[PDB]
Write a protein that binds this DNA or RNA. Structure first.
Lengths: 120, 120, 121
RNA sequence: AUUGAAAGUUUUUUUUUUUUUUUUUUUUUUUUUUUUUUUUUUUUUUUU
């Protein structure tokens, strides 16, 4: 997922010695970041797992797990990145067209195209 | 080439700082890293030139160094600007780490001449 | 030929690093791998020279080794530079794996001499 | 001037087909940009 309206921001964080509070013990580390808000080109392929129609009962609970993951990504958004504990790194999928391609009728031509919101 | 311009501007910026207790460059690496960070964050050339001019007015940047930077970045694309700034930062870092004397690099105009001087 | 240059460069780069509490060469295999990767990715010789100069200025590459590298990698083709860097990496890896002492190996300036030294003992 | 000789071991045949160096593997775990500094001193709401 490459970025388009990105912007690199540098943040400098230093520690505070517990004894004699306030002194910087020289652990001054500066890290690079992306701007809070920038589009990313997301593309994902899933094979042999119907989502728009779903599978009846064969190897099920995998479609449910995938839908749960997608719902978490869309509404809440997962945490990725280097720090991931001080809030650095929280991606979210705003909108995504879900295009279904079926082999027998027409694989190149999409069968059903729907927005991801209706899928979940 | 961009590298020749980068070497020339780094040489102009490695001039000794007048009226200093110790022999040190007139321009510090912190300024160069700030230039890089500002260009990455703002992602434009106009306010980058504005910041360069403000720094030059507030000392810490040689007048000829600022003039060369302004002439180089007067009309340049963002990618070309960041490439030039990265080259300048690397050349300045090399000069500082090598503790190269200014008087021996007052006549270099290209990158090949500087490379030969460093090798010999 | 190129192998002699590579051997001399590796010998210069394998000199013990002062102010280091553990016996190790002045440079590290990570530096050589970074050199090769940078040359492959950037596909430019002048950028490689800039990388070498910055690594030398970072007080992690011996100044004599840096001078040798800069002397060798000027007016030289990209393919020749790649071959020389590969030879340097292989010789350095061999010396590191064999734990060759720098004291008894700094006196050789020919690849054949190094081969004879390794074969004899 | 051999009992005495004059005949290419030659023609002809593709070492070819089947097979994705592939699956799995988040360069993350930790660290408060704080810390010492009084917007202070000088000046008569006033004369022919």
């Amino acid at each position: 997922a490459i970025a388009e309206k990105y912007s690199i921001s540098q943040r400098t964080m230093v520690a505070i010695n517990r004894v004699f509070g306030g002194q910087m013990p020289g652990h001054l580390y500066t890290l690079d970041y992306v701007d809070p808000g920038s589009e990313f080109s997301f593309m994902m392929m899933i094979y042999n797992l119907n989502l728009i129609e779903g599978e009846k009962d064969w190897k099920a609970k995998s479609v449910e797990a995938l839908k749960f993951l997608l719902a978490t990504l869309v509404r809440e958004g997962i945490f990725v990145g280097a720090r991931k504990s001080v809030g650095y790194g929280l991606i979210k999928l705003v909108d995504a067209k879900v295009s279904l391609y079926k082999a027998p009728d027409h694989l190149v031509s999409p069968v059903i195209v729907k927005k991801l919101e209706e899928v979940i | 080439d961009l590298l020749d311009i980068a070497t020339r501007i780094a040489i102009s910026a490695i001039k000794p700082k007048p009226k200093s207790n110790k022999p040190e460059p007139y321009v510090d690496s912190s300024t160069i890293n700030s230039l890089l960070s500002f260009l990455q964050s703002r992602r434009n050339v106009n306010e980058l030139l504005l910041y360069i001019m403000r720094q030059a007015g507030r000392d810490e940047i040689d007048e000829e160094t600022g003039k060369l930077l302004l002439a180089s970045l007067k009309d340049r694309e963002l990618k070309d600007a960041v490439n030039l700034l990265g080259y300048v930062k690397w050349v300045y870092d090399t000069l500082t780490g090598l503790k190269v004397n200014y008087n021996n690099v007052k006549g270099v105009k290209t990158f090949k001449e500087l490379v030969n001087i460093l090798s010999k």
